Amino acid sequence: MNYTETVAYIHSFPRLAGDHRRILTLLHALGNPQQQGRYIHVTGTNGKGSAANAIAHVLEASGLTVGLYTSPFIMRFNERIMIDHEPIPDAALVNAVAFVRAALERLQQQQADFNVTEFEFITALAYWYFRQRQVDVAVIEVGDSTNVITPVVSVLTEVALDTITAIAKHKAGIIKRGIPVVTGNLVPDAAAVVAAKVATTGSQWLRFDRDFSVPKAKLHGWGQRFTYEDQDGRISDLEVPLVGDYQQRNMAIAIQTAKVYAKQTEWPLTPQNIRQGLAASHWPARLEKISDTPLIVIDGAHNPDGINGLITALKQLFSQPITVIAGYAAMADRLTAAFSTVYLVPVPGTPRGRLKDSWQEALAASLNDVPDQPIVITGSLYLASAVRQTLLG
Ligand SMILES: [Mg+2]
């Protein structure tokens, strides 16, 4: 096939019904690449994509070839599988999809009704591609079809209040015997689930605000300047180009995890690597300022927690009036009460306050009416990625 037939073939996979048998059957046909190499396992309800990207950036700056498996993509499909922050080239995706389909067709010649899902096909391809390219470590963000590895260190960023013990027990399945777990400051029910699991596995548990912390943090331009502290000391005046107070805990989790990786593998990691790797830690479409003149910021906050955390982040950055373009009525009532011009438009991959029929009509209106006013586009990551693909791709 071509690339276009290859990405359409990946999306043609079904919606099957538990354990990891189907993906392990497929992975045995690929020669078990999940059993070789080093891995960092990342799960959590929020902040896992941001942490994983930060861990990868810090490890790459120390001189390691880092594979990175994330979801979702923002600009193109190829962003889900990266090696040193470069998305898997089209032709390499064409080759890899052809190799995995060939092994899958061999498996269907034996077991006639064998199949896998879309995420299981992608995860198996990701794990085979990282071994083919021979990376030093692969940072794996949890989708659990990825739970077929023994990591060097596991990360559990958050189990947020949105049942808690039932969610925490599903998330604690990535914690393995003797392998250290780096977590955030978990809520009581999630913490009790983590404490009992690590007493069972015998794991070293490094927790945010206990073993490591951020004693100083403040805004500095479009990003934050902060100080990290642990048992080895402090690394002061670290800078990341990400706004939001919740990002202080994701970066701190990322720094602690990277240090736990290097100590376990006897790899040298300096504070310089951590500093340089945190400076390169850009995470697209998450309060990203994409244009200076005119001022345009894109964001994918989609819950009311995301709307409330955005509102105070926008208040921190802007003391002038802005136009906010929003992709239900409780999310829109807090936007109208806090901001100037507010436009409600439709999100592009969905179906059926000032109303606009599209985000382009709202953006053209604001630029025509008041050209010096900043525009923030928020409400969905799919709407935010549509604006980013249009305005930059
Ligand atoms: Mg993510």
UniProtKB/Swiss-Prot annotation:
Residues involved in (6R)-5,10-methylenetetrahydrofolyl-(gamma-L-Glu)n binding: F73, R80, S385
Statement: the UniProt record of this protein carries the keyword Transcription: no
InterPro entries according to UniProt: Folylpolyglutamate_synth, Folylpolyglutamate_synth_CS, Mur-like_cat_sf, Mur_ligase_C, Mur_ligase_C_dom_sf, Mur_ligase_cen
Cofactor(s) needed: Mg(2+)
Residue numbers binding ATP: G47, K48, G49, S50, N250, R286, D299, G300, A301, H302
Activity-regulation annotation: Competitively inhibited by adenosine 5'-(3-thio)triphosphate and beta,gamma-methylene-ATP.
Chain sites annotated for binding Mg(2+) 1: S71, E141
Gene Ontology CC terms: cytoplasm
UniProt superkingdom: Bacteria
UniProt entry tagged with the keyword Nucleotide-binding: yes
Mutation effect (H302A): Loss of activity
Assigned EC number: 6.3.2.17
Biophysicochemical property: pH dependence: Optimum pH is about 10.
GO BP annotations, alphabetical order: one-carbon metabolic process
Pfam families in alphabetical order: Mur_ligase_C, Mur_ligase_M
Stated role: Involved in the conversion of folates to polyglutamate derivatives, and likely functions in the retention of cellular folate pools. Catalyzes successive MgATP-dependent additions of glutamate to a pteroylmonoglutamate substrate, with a high preference for 5,10-methylenetetrahydrofolate (mTHF). Thus, metabolizes mTHF to the tetraglutamate derivative, but longer glutamate chain length products are not observed. Tetrahydrofolate (H4PteGlu) and 10-formyl-H4PteGlu are poorer folate substrates. In contrast to E.coli FolC, this enzyme does not display dihydrofolate synthase activity.
Further details from the record: In contrast to many bacteria such as E.coli and Corynebacterium spp., L.casei cannot synthesize folate de novo, and requires exogenous folates for growth. L.casei metabolizes folate to polyglutamates of chain length up to 11, with octa- and nonaglutamates predominating. Kinetic studies are consistent with an ordered Ter-Ter mechanism with MgATP binding first to the enzyme, folate second, and glutamate last. The order of product dissociation from the enzyme is ADP, folate product, and Pi.
Quaternary structure and partners: Monomer.
NCBIfam families: folC (TIGR01499)
Similarity comment: family membership: Belongs to the folylpolyglutamate synthase family.
Name of this protein: Folylpolyglutamate synthase
Organism this protein belongs to: Lacticaseibacillus casei (Lactobacillus casei)
Gene expressing this chain: fpgS
